[PDB]
Amino acid sequence: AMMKAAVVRAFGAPLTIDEVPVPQPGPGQVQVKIEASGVCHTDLHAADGDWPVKPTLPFIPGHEGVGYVSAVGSGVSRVKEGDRVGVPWLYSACGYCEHCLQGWETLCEKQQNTGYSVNGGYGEYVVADPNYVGLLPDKVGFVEIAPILCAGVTVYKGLKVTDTRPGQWVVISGIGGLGHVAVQYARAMGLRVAAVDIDDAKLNLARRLGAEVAVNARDTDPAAWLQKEIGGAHGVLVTAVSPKAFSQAIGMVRRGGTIALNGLPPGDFGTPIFDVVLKGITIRGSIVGTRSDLQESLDFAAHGDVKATVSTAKLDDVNDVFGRLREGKVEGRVVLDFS
Amino acid sequence: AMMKAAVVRAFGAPLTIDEVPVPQPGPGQVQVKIEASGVCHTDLHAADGDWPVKPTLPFIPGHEGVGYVSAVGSGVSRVKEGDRVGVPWLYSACGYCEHCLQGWETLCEKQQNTGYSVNGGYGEYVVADPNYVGLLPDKVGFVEIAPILCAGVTVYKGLKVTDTRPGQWVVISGIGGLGHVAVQYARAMGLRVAAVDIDDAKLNLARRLGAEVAVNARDTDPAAWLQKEIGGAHGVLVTAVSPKAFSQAIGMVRRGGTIALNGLPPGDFGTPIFDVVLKGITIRGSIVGTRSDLQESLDFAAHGDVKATVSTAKLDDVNDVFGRLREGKVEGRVVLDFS
Amino acid sequence: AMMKAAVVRAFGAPLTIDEVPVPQPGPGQVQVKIEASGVCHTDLHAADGDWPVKPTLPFIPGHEGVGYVSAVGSGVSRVKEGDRVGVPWLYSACGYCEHCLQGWETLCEKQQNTGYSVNGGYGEYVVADPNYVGLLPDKVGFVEIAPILCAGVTVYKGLKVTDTRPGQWVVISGIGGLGHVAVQYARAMGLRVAAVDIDDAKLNLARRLGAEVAVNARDTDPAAWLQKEIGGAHGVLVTAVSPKAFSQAIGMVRRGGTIALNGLPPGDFGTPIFDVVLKGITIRGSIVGTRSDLQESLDFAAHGDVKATVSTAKLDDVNDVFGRLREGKVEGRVVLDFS
Amino acid sequence: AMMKAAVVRAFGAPLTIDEVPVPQPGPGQVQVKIEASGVCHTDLHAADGDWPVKPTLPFIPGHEGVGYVSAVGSGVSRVKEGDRVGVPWLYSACGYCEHCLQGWETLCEKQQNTGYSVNGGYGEYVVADPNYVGLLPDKVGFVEIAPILCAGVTVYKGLKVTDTRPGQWVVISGIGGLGHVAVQYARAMGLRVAAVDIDDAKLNLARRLGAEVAVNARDTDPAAWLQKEIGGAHGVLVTAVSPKAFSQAIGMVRRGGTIALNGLPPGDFGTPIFDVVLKGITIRGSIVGTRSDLQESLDFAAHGDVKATVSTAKLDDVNDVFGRLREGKVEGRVVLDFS
Ligand SMILES: [Zn+2]
Ligand SMILES: [Zn+2]
Ligand SMILES: [Zn+2]
Ligand SMILES: [Zn+2]
Ligand SMILES: [Zn+2]
Ligand SMILES: [Zn+2]
Ligand SMILES: [Zn+2]
Ligand SMILES: [Zn+2]
């Protein structure tokens, strides 16, 4: 009846580790026992409450929780006790709005979000909607699979909406937490991959993961270089959306090409409409994804095509993890290990 | 031997009506006797030398010339003497680059542009490439059809790239020279049309042409109203591309929707990345169109679905017309009448 | 506690109008009072039990029932008492299989079918799944809207999967119970309609409904004719699926075109793989549609774009209705009027 | 002045290896010195004149000729002397019909076909239209690349039109001359490949080339097995269209899936309309492809993803070759070597 969990009580404050009541599932709900729980920058923004729509205090963060179905409410048929599931950002949606009926539930105006508008996975247990959980692959461990619920589906869907075709070129801009996962999806999707970053080790990693071309933006203008070397990319996935990354993306793409934006930066970005219109460039926003996107993302992991860089930490130490993220001292993804 | 033509001999200077030699079709070329010749803002930009890539001086403007094939060079099979044809913006393209092979010849780096890089239809005769001329509908007059070569194909392709389909909502932003034509194409394409402008008469016109709803942005916030009334529009066609229209388009579009920018504004626009990403919005530019787009655009006119607002002027009075366009005192489209 | 209902108790046997218990909604279910109930050939097949997968006896047919929500079980948020709803062929689907997740719930292997695998609309009351009912437009009467639940969505979805665009040609093959509805959707979707049939009166009905071209296959080869007169059709909707209509569709469609089969005939059809391959033709089947398809199809009715030719009858005369259908003596659609 | 060439002079007869005049390029044409020349079953059908539209006698067959541009006609700009090119099935097209304008020149009704309606590559030299030749990759030898002009583009385009996405399952039906190349393209396109045939040596070749699953059609039932093993294939590419292969494809395909037919068999094939409609299956014909398809297909060979199994033979032995083909006793692809 009691469990440990990291709670946000004041925006900007450190999280407190508490013993709170174990959530019980009602009709059409399930309870999940958390075995691992991914951490990412979205959790920082949730804890700082610096986005337009804020979480309601207090709340348990975490939209990358994975574990076992430990209890089942009435009317549940998709999963059963013992099943390995994840509880992603899309906690639930209404299921009958236009978006939901067309398989774009990720756009549902009535959606709830895990570890944001409802309690998430920074706890030993969590109550989820079984219609929206991710069904985890048998072959992949909890720690390794957790980031796929977030980083994985985000970059996979992002790549899909670049509208690129096997054999065509895609630039992965930024080979960090998201980017290094993106390279692997891109290669698995038959794309020729160009990696762009400012860190030579990250570029090497990209090459190892499948990138045929890699350019260090500190040593050379990536736009001019790529235009010359590959004739511009058919697609660009921008995983870290800084003003510079945005501008460079526009310069790197070939005529008729598409730029997909994964990040959520603040402010207005300078956009060369003249060039975009003239060059017939498309700019498209894409974050997370639908249930089908998620299952597809998980399958690539199961098949051995994608493996996130993961490092573990304990629930108790979640505040140290946050600190490391804030300072940009994390390489890969960090995952809380509950076992 | 000789013919009258309006000629640009210096950028920014008034045009002069000169007697010049009648152009002669060589092999693979045809000669066209101009019966009418549309005028639009692009001609100003051409005559002003406003754009980064300029016409060579001196030149005869006019990318909206229509008339009869008057002479046929050797090796021509597509048209014959007497055929009614138009010589649109796309004078020619290479035909074998990646873009040309994919049916996107509008992106051809090697393209020539009528009344810009080569002489156009502000003259009694013009030489054209028969592989790129528009084949005009039997049933529509020269004056009436001229603007379809430019305004028509521009808004039609624009609507196509909003990726909408019958029954869905599209906003036509701006019911002016392009906008009044766009409303008609949109309705013929089975779209529900919401018109937005600041002029009562233009909004009335929009409704007359098939718009289901009309919002006057002077009196009501069209973003707020449309979000509340129709849940936002699946597509937005921005026909007057200003910073304000851009920002309002983002407000009017529903999640997952597409904004098409139908013009070449100067200077960067501020793009709120956060909203674009969260809402999963697509932004793209669309100006003119391919030969396929052009033929399709003309067929809609032939079928009676689209009729541009047109008033005539004489070649001799071209500078007055330029003046009126510059002042923004033109309602509809102006077409030079050579009859 | 009781109600009238037409019940099938023996396959092939005349239906019996019986007094049966009024069905009560459990958790997540709703009850609908039927005001009108469309009849079609699918009901004959249900009653005859001649399809591979058969209904369980005894059962109440009817998948075109429309009426008011008369009661609501617990955990129901989509509808409430008084709401006008329809209970279409797709009674329920699992909601989480590959097909359901992608908004293709019509392919769900676990689907239930109204008036086939569960009791349907040939009764005064029926219990339905609120997540799958059709939400009816306020401005259309129960009798007029009923056939939209079946004929409407069927031909609308069929038209969608012909992959045709506004301005393109579509052949409506057979201008009968389905076809006369199809001509109307097609025109509302911006398609040029060519009607093909062997009944002059049916062909003239097509023209009245917006067909531009009409060919009697009895005296003229529609394939040869259309290939000459319009260049072949971009799409063909076959609403009366016979081997001849099928073979002719293959001749009528232009290269790269698409044939949609809108029916469930018995037996294998001879298909000239040679012509299909050489002509790059696409062939696919389509019946009824998804919840999204249904709501979209109802919208066209709400806007006055589509009206089915409807005649009414009494529940007690259902066997007579069946009789007329079996003989082919039905013009338009027949709807049981529960008033 | 003169050259060796294999000529068809009578339908069904042995080819005569003669000395004939060397074709000379006129305006807009180029001359190609053949270095290698693929042979395939289409060549047999050309020589036997058993297709509805027949070649005109006499003629030199061969639509898989590759070599060097040996001479250039007037006004040619796409290629130059020395360039390595191939002369595929699509010799030329309108350039301006609806199909050509939309980048589907493969469907042009006015197309010429290499080694069928015009002289082909079974000779030391050939004249071709530079606008339609394949531009060969630098690092691939003539013998190796030749079959890509026919087998390669055919299966690549076929795979594209199965509408399958990376991570999805495709069955390659028949691992023969076409099939063994198809397995390689499919793998490069991120598809998971199930190879199906009746020859265990072929299936081992498949696995060798990346097939993840292989099932012998004479051993077990492929439909039942794949439905169990994989849940059915999202796509099926039928490279050898035998009545049993066609029937088995309809059984192997997943609900909502697509079957692409690459073959040109004689006669009608039985198609279960009932199942096709109910399972929402798409049947699509596809052979060869556009210039864009061809260049993409060559790019995969350049990138190292695709290599045809090739064996050489001398021009003077072409009759022996045909003999080997007819007896279904040819492994991989035979290429005539003019070195
Ligand atoms: Zn995350
Ligand atoms: Zn929703
Ligand atoms: Zn213009
Ligand atoms: Zn080009
Ligand atoms: Zn029905
Ligand atoms: Zn399902
Ligand atoms: Zn061949
Ligand atoms: Zn053509």
Among left, alpha and beta (phi > 0; psi -120 to 50; other), residue A330 is beta
Query: Peptide bond before B58: cis, by omega within 30 degrees of 0?
Result: yes
Contact (CB, 8 A) for A318 and A173: no
Looking at the structure, tell me whether residues D116 and D173 fall in a common domain: no
Number of independent structural domains in chain D: 2
CA distance D38 to B311: 62
Q: Match 């691939």 to its residue by tokens.
A: D140
CA distances from B242 to A278, B225, B239 (A): 16, 20, 9
Residues B140 and B186 in one domain: no
Judging contacts by C-beta atoms under 8 Å, the chain D residues touching residue A190 are 166, 188-190
A59 reaches D (C-beta below 8 A): no
Under 8 Å between Cβ of A190 and D188: yes
**Sequence-separated (6 or more) residues with CB below 8 Å from residue C154:** C178, C262, C286, C287, C288, C289
Same domain as A296, residue A249: no
Domain boundary among B269, B287, B305: B287
Place of tokens 């079984």: A130
Residue with tokens 């028949």: D174
Q: CA nearest C266 in D: which residue? A: D274
Q: How many residues does chain A have?
A: 339
Q: What is the CATH number of the domain that holds D127?
A: 3.90.180.10
Each residue of C275-307: b (16+ CB within 10 Å) or e? bbbbbbbbbbbbbbbbbbbbbbbbbbbeeebbb
d(CA A304, CA B242): 49
E strand or H helix at C47, and its extent? Answer: helix C41-48
B208: burial class by Cβ within 10 Å (0-12, 13-18, 19+)? exposed
Distance CA A171, CA A155 (A): 12
Number of residues that this document lists for chain B = 339
A274 and A170 share one domain: yes
Q: What is the CATH number of the domain that holds C266?
A: 3.40.50.720
Q: Is D263 in CB contact (< 8 Å) with chain C?
A: yes
- The size of chain D, in residues, is 339
The approach used to solve this structure was X-ray
Interface partners of chain D (CB pairs < 8 Å, 3 or more) are A, B, C
SS3 of chain B: the string is CEEEEEEECCCCCCCEEEEEECCCCCCCCEEEEEEEEEECHHHHHHHHCCCCCCCCCCECCCCCEEEEEEEECCCCCCCCCCCEEEECCEEECCCCCHHHHCCCHHHCCCCEEECCCECCCCECEEEECCCCCEECCCCCCHHHHHHHHCHHHHHHHHHHCCCCCCCCEEEEECCCCCHHHHHHHHHHCCCEEEEEECCHHHHHHHHHCCCCEEEECCCCCHHHHHHHHHCCEEEEEECCCCHHHHHHHHHHEEEEEEEEECCCCCCCEEEEHHHHHHHCCEEEECCCCCHHHHHHHHHHHHCCCCCCCEEEECHHHHHHHHHHHHHCCCCCEEEEECC
Residue A36 contacts residue A335 (beta carbons within 8 Å): yes
CA A130, CA A73: separation in Å to the nearest integer? 10
- The sign one gets for the Cα dihedral A126, A128, A133, A135 is positive
Output phi, psi for D121, to 5 deg: -90, 5
In sequence order, the 6+-apart residues with CB closer than 8 A to the CB of B240 are: B173, B174, B176, B178, B179, B263
User: What three-state secondary structure class fits A65?
Assistant: strand
How far apart (Å, rounded) are the C-alpha atoms in residues D94 and B6?
Answer: 35
Nearest to A255 by CA among A226, A228, A283, A278: A278
Answer whether C279 touches D (CB < 8 Å): yes
Tell how strand C112-113 and strand C192-197 pair up.
unpaired
Angle at D22 between CA D17 and CA D27, to 5 degrees: 140
Residue type, A170: V
- A138 plus A6 within the same structural domain: yes
Q: Which amino acid does the sequence have at A114?
A: T
Residue B102 burial class via C-beta count within 10 angstroms: exposed 0-12, middle 13-18, buried 19 and up: middle
Which positions ≥6 away from A17 have C-beta within 8 Å?
A4, A5, A6, A7, A315, A316, A318
CA distances from D325 to A260, C306, D44, D317, D333 (A): 50, 58, 8, 13, 10
- CA–CA gap between residue C194 and residue D42 (Å, rounded): 37
**Do the annotations mark residue D41 as ligand-binding?**
yes
Q: Is C28 on the interface with A (CB under 8 A)?
A: yes
Cβ D106 vs Cβ D90: under 8 Å: yes
Give the integer Cα–Cα distance in Å for B186 and D293.
33
With 0-12 / 13-18 / 19 or more C-beta atoms within 10 angstroms meaning exposed / middle / buried, residue A54 is: middle
- B248 and B305 in a common domain: no
Length of chain C: 339
CB under 5 Å of ion ligand 7: residues? D 40, 42, 150
Strand extents, DSSP E, chain D = 2-7, 16-21, 30-39, 65-72, 84-87, 90-92, 112-113, 125-128, 134-135, 169-173, 192-197, 213-216, 233-238, 253-261, 268-272, 282-285, 310-313, 333-337
Q: How far is A29 from chain D (nearest CA, A)?
A: 28
Encoding tokens for residue C216?
């009697």
Closest CA to A145 of A284, A16, A304: A304
Which DSSP category does D308 fall into?
A: -
Range of the domain at A21: 1-149+288-339
Tokens for D7? 């000529």
DSSP codes, A261-307: E----SSEEEE-HHHHHHTT-EEEE--S--HHHHHHHHHHHHTTS--
Which DSSP symbol is given to D161? T
Partners of residue B285 in chain A, C-beta under 8 Å: 273, 276-281
Q: What is the CA radius of gyration of chain C?
A: 20
The token duo for D134 is 């394949």
Quickly tell me which residue has 């020619």 as its tokens: B92
Residue D172 identity (one-letter amino acid):
I
Beta bridge partners of D196: D173, D215
Put simply, the answer to whether A99 touches B266 (Cβ < 8 Å) is: no
CA pair distance D267, D254, nearest whole angstrom: 26
CA C337 to centroid of ligand 3, rounded, Å = 58
Which of A43, A262, A278, A29 lies closest to A152 in space, CA to CA? A262
Distance CA B122, CA B61 (A): 6
* D333-337 and C333-337 strand pairing: unpaired
C157 and C250 inside one domain = yes
Q: Measured in angstroms, how far is the CA atom of residue A103 from the centroid of ligand 6?
A: 13
The DSSP H or E segment spanning D117 is none
Distances (CA, A) of C325 to B38, B151, C179, C322, D148: 59, 52, 16, 5, 56
Query: Distance from A15 to chain D by nearest Cα, in Å?
Result: 40
Rounded to 5 degrees, φ, ψ at B140 are -115, 135
Give the Å distances, CA to CA, from C8 to C14, C44, C90, C264, C338. Answer: 7, 10, 20, 22, 19
At residue A69, φ and ψ (nearest 5 deg) are -65, 115
Tell me which amino acid residue B286 is.
Answer: S
Cα separation, B232 vs B236, in Å, equals: 10
Neighbours of ion ligand 8 (CB under 5 A): D 93-94, 97, 100, 108
Domain termination residue (choose one: B287, B304, B319): B287
Which ligand ends up closest to the CA of D308? 7
Domain boundary among C248, C269, C287: C287
Spatial CB neighbours of D67, under 8 Å, sequence gap ≥ 6? D32, D33, D34, D35, D36, D84, D85, D86, D142, D338
Residue B204's φ and ψ, nearest 5 degrees, are -55, -45
Chain C 164-183, residues with CB within 8 Å of chain B CB atoms: 166-167
Cα separation, A322 vs A328, in Å, equals: 10
Q: How far is the CA of B227 from the centre of ligand 1 (A)?
A: 29
* Secondary structure letter of residue C305 according to DSSP: S
Q: Taking CB atoms and an 8 Å cutoff, what residues of chain D touch C265?
A: 273-274
Q: Are residues D264 and D326 in the same domain?
A: no
Nearest residue in chain C measured CA to CA from D256: C107
Cβ(A254)–Cβ(A234) below 8 Å: yes
CA dihedral B49, B50, B53, B54 (to 10 degrees): -10
Instruction: Find, in chain C, the residue whose alpha carbon is nearest to that of D280.
Output: C285
| Strand-pair category, A84-87 with A65-72 | antiparallel
State the ligand closest to the CA atom of D77.
Answer: 4
- A268 and A329 in a single domain? The answer is no
* B277/B159 same-domain check: yes
Residues A131 and A3 in one domain: yes
Q: Answer yes or no: do B165 and B248 share one domain.
A: yes
CB of A103 within 8 Å of any CB in chain D?
A: no
